[PDB]
Design a binder for this molecule. Structure first.
Ligand SMILES: Cc1nc(N)c2ncn(C3CN(C(=O)c4cc(CN5CCN(C6CCCCCC6)CC5)n(C)n4)C3)c2n1
Ligand SMILES: [Zn+2]
Ligand SMILES: [Zn+2]
Ligand SMILES: [Zn+2]
Length: 430
């Protein structure tokens, strides 16, 4: 199945539908772009980005009716109106209690899009939204109850402005959205919004992917990070590649109900380094290691929950205490330590403790470089944060160096002409 040039849809043995190359692609080549089928700017970025096109700039004009949507100009505002009108009056009516989840917000837009544009869109050249996997038969009752709550919230916040299909159809759709929806992030991997990119959702998973997905406004772009030969399958990663094999496959199993057999998962080459044990005089016993791994996974999950109701200083305390406890057995380059160091850095940034955030960054960066693959956005984002921190604290040489490391990754991932790169070059001069 063809039309996107140089590519086709096919049946990948052992995996199912996928995407393969018909022509070579070199590192940094653009395979395809996919316009968003539906998308929504996250609430905390309102006023910083245009709701229609996601341009980040000053001096955006306001929707006069609700005062909660911002735009480059009246053309962006008018083009956004079919989607924005789903929320404009409801925000006025509900005021401070207007609070649908972002999943609910995105699903409302999908429904409006289906009504206005029932035919195949340019976002769906090889895979249609209706063909999305739901995994509905594999979901437990807890997840199905959350789907029913989303349906309830959809009705509650959007009923004046949408006609709904039946409960059965919404259950399928919500399940499809839960597992197919993408996040759009900025250059520091900060959350900007959510979107549906149907053609991107065709790609199968590898823990050594040969492409990387980036965003230019609401457009997804897919570039090669390894050489791809004619006839080879195009693989993205569905999950965070920092973690060792068991953890990667736990996340794959819980969200998509499969496990990976790629070369990384097969060989487990990076696993030993990822869970590095301190080389002490009396080395830690095997039991103690299992104990500390168990503790680490617990605190990682505990911390995920705790950030919905603890203060910044309490969160930093959990990070510090967990790091102290883990350091009896784990090296600082160990991925569970890096996890908590990364959370700590974010808490520091939130509190405007620039020095503290910088110190955490300096310890994270070299382990990141080794644990992630070559052209990782996680690595690039960390160099950029370091660079910006260094610049702000007047370490101009160190800052320039870090920003250059960011650029060298981003030229490949984002393309040399991406506006993010122009902005970062300006920071090196200014
Ligand atoms: C045996 C085997 N081995 C493999 N190596 C492999 N690779 C892919 N598969 C099959 C099984 N698949 C799915 O269950 C699937 C695929 C998608 C599309 N999703 C992916 C996540 N996508 C982002 C990931 C990035 C971060 C944001 C979240 C969603 C959205 C689109 N869904 C919702 N289910 C396809 C494989 N099977
Ligand atoms: Zn705009
Ligand atoms: Zn409005
Ligand atoms: Zn794998």
């Amino acid at each position: 199945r063809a039309e996107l040039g140089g590519l086709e849809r096919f049946c990948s043995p052992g995996k199912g539908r996928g995407l393969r190359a018909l022509q070579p692609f070199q590192v940094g080549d653009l395979l395809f772009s996919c316009p968003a089928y539906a998308y929504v700017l996250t609430v905390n970025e309102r006023g910083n980005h245009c709701e229609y096109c996601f341009t980040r700039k000053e001096g955006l004009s306001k929707c006069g009716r609700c005062k909660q949507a911002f735009y480059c100009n009246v053309e962006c505002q008018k083009e956004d109106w079919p989607m924005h009108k789903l929320e404009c009056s409801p925000m006025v009516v509900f005021g401070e209690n207007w609070n649908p989840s972002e999943t609910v917000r995105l699903t409302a837009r999908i429904l409006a899009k289906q009504k206005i544009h029932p035919e195949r869109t340019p976002s769906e050249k090889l895979l249609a939204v209706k063909e999305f996997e739901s995994h509905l038969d594999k979901l437990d009752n807890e997840k199905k109850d959350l789907i029913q709550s989303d349906i309830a919230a959809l009705h509650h916040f959007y009923s004046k402005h949408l006609e709904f299909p039946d409960n059965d159809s919404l259950v399928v759709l919500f399940a499809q959205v839960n597992c197919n929806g993408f996040t759009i992030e900025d250059e520091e991997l900060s959350h900007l919004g959510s979107a549906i990119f149907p053609d991107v959702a065709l790609m199968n998973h590898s823990c050594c992917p040969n492409v990387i997905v980036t965003y230019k406004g609401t457009l997804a772009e897919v570039r090669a990070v390894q050489e791809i030969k004619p006839g080879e399958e195009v693989f993205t990663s569905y999950i965070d590649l920092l973690y060792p094999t068991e953890d990667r496959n736990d996340r794959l199993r819980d969200s998509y109900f499969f496990t990976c057999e790629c070369q990384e998962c097969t060989t487990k080459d990076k696993d030993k380094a990822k869970v590095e044990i301190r080389k002490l005089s009396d080395p830690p016993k095997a039991e103690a290691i299992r104990d500390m791994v168990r503790y680490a996974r617990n605190v990682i999950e505990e911390f995920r929950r705790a950030k919905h109701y603890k203060s910044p200083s309490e969160l930093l305390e959990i990070c510090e205490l967990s790091q102290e406890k883990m350091s009896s057995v784990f090296e600082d380059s160990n991925v569970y330590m890096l996890h908590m160091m990364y959370q700590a850095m974010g808490v520091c940034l939130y509190m405007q403790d620039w020095e503290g955030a910088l110190q955490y960054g300096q310890k994270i960066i070299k382990p990141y470089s080794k644990h992630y693959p070559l052209y990782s956005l996680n690595v690039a984002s960390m160099w950029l944060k370091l660079g910006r921190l260094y610049m702000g604290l007047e370490h101009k040489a160190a800052g320039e160096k870090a920003l250059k490391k960011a650029i060298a990754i981003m030229e490949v991932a984002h393309g040399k002409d991406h506006p993010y790169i122009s902005e970062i070059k300006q920071e090196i001069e200014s």
